[PDB]
């Protein structure tokens, strides 16, 4: 084993060249010479909400069956707003 | 669905044991939990399966985040055989990891509980395949077993990591999200389980042993894994086991299929269709 003298010398020379190259890779102080808060809430959560609510209320809510919701739960003892009916109470049990 | 989920649960719970990669262990844990959800669907409990989905998201994401923090703090090391002592060197990440691990297991009144406990109760109190039920319980034990594996080999040992140490949890972008996921893993299961409308009728009348099976098997798995892990420090050489190899090499399913199927397919595609 062990580096032969030629291997050692070549490794030294390549080491010197590689280290100089890596040093040259360094950027100079001037190198990147570039050439010459509710704001988010209002910008992204208010204007798009205006647009979306407009679209819904005046293009989706006006078309048939475009928005459909399951019937609300009715329990014995409730008053329906539209018809005013009062659901009769339930039977009494032990 | 019941049989497939039970098989997946058992197989991946086995594979998780004897895995020396934190991400791989967590992935196999995910596969096991998905097998459990599939068993829940094999029983007619779709709402319960979805509840488990929602509850498991929290602590699984938290566990993966904690593992990521550990791997980043170490020089990108994922093998648990070069970790240890994280309980002392990383108090915050270790605490979050332990919270997530107990949540994954059926620790009472954590986000995992309100899904895993009910799934196990429903499994016991239903008309089901005896083998599916038995291996599902064995897998529920193996879950705590491999969680204890992670905890022990990544927290309860002496440091096995390289000697130069550059560990820094102190960064809001790391700390805050894990804190949020920890609040989740502690309270979200309770809050959801109370807020959601009644979906199905559970069975709450069962023998004491059926009721407490989840806790009992989880604790039994914890103790057995603890004893086996304590036995590793004994100065006796570990000899290869056929079952240990079956677990480690993923049951040979990759090694066999990923070599025989593509080989035959590609050999046909060349020698038959194209050339001949």
């Amino acid at each position: 084993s062990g580096y032969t003298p030629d291997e050692k010398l070549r490794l030294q020379q390549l080491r010197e060249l590689r280290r100089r190259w890596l040093k040259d890779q360094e950027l100079s102080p001037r190198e990147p010479v570039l050439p010459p808060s509710s704001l988010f809430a209002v910008s992204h959560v208010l204007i798009p909400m205006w647009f979306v609510h407009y679209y819904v209320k005046y293009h989706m809510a006006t078309k048939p069956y475009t928005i459909v919701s399951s019937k609300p739960r009715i329990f014995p003892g409730d008053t329906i707003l539209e018809t005013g009916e009062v659901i009769p109470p339930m039977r009494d049990f032990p | 669905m019941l049989c497939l989920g039970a098989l997946t649960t058992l197989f991946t719970a086995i594979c998780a044991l004897t895995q020396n990669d934190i991400k791989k262990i967590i992935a196999f844990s995910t596969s096991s939990q998905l097998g459990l959800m599939m068993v829940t669907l094999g029983m007619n409990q779709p709402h319960l399966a979805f509840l488990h989905i929602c509850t498991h998201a929290f602590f699984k994401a938290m566990l993966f985040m904690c593992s990521g923090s550990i791997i980043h703090s170490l020089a990108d090391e994922q093998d648990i055989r070069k970790m240890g002592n994280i309980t002392k060197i990383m108090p915050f990440t270790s605490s979050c990891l332990v919270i997530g691990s107990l949540a994954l297991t059926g620790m009472p009144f954590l986000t995992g509980f309100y899904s895993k406990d009910l799934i196990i109760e429903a499994i016991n109190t239903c008309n089901t395949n005896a083998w599916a039920l038995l291996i599902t319980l064995i897998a529920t034990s193996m879950t705590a077993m491999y969680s204890m594996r992670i905890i022990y080999f990544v927290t309860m040992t002496k440091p096995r990591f390289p000697p130069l140490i550059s560990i820094n949890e102190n960064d809001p972008d790391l700390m805050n999200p894990i804190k949020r996921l920890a609040f989740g893993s502690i309270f979200a299961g309770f809050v959801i389980s109370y807020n959601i409308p009644p979906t199905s009728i559970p069975v709450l009348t069962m023998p004491w042993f059926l009721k407490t099976t989840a806790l009992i098997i989880s604790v039994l798995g914890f103790l057995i894994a603890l004893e086996l892990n304590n036995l590793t420090m004994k100065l006796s050489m570990n000899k290869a086991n056929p079952y240990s190899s079956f677990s480690t090499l993923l049951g040979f399913f990759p090694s066999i299929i990923h070599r025989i199927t593509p080989m035959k397919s590609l050999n046909l595609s060349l020698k038959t269709s194209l050339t001949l």
């Binding site: 205006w50 407009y54 209320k57 069956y65 399951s70 019937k71 609300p72 009715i74 409730d78 329906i80 | -």
Partner: protein
């Protein structure tokens, strides 16, 4: 929107009837919504409609007079056959849309009735089944080259089968 074509039952909403000391967050969120979001949008829409009131124009739904059917003129009279084929294509295109309307009815009924769809969508399901049988007897099994002549042949075969069965 015509309710006769698209029947929508009357809503039956229960009264609030709160029974707690806490405030309902949804009510205050809906108030803030009706103020911030619902009002400026309503004003913009009213302005748009006011502008539409001026520059108002009307468009009409075209009417096609019935022309002689395929049955009514001779084999190989391409003029007759073209007229009848265009008319048949129009009627087929309209049958498709009637199919679609009734399918929408059925889907809306299922969503609305929700958990009672097995019992409260009987009317819509029966309508779907009957109109579906009619559509199948008219148009099913005609090629990608379906035409008035193929429809007539199918109807005549079905009529012959019905007549033979009635004789037997």
């Amino acid at each position: 929107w015509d309710k006769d074509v698209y029947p929508e039952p009357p809503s039956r909403t229960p009264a609030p009837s709160p029974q707690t000391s806490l405030p309902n967050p949804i009510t205050y969120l809906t108030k803030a919504y009706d103020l911030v979001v619902d009002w400026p949008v309503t004003l913009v829409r009213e302005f748009i409609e006011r502008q539409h009131a001026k520059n108002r124009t009307y468009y009409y739904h075209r009417q096609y007079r019935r022309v002689p059917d395929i049955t009514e003129c001779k084999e190989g009279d391409v003029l007759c056959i073209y007229e009848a084929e265009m008319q048949w294509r129009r009627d087929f295109k309209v049958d498709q849309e009637i199919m679609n309307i009734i399918q929408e009815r059925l889907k809306a009924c299922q969503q609305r009735e929700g958990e009672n769809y097995q019992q409260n969508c009987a009317k819509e399901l029966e309508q779907f089944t009957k109109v579906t049988k009619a559509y199948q007897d008219r148009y099913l099994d005609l090629g990608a080259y379906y035409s008035a002549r193929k429809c007539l042949a199918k109807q005549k075969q079905r009529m012959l089968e019905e007549r033979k069965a009635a004789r037997q």
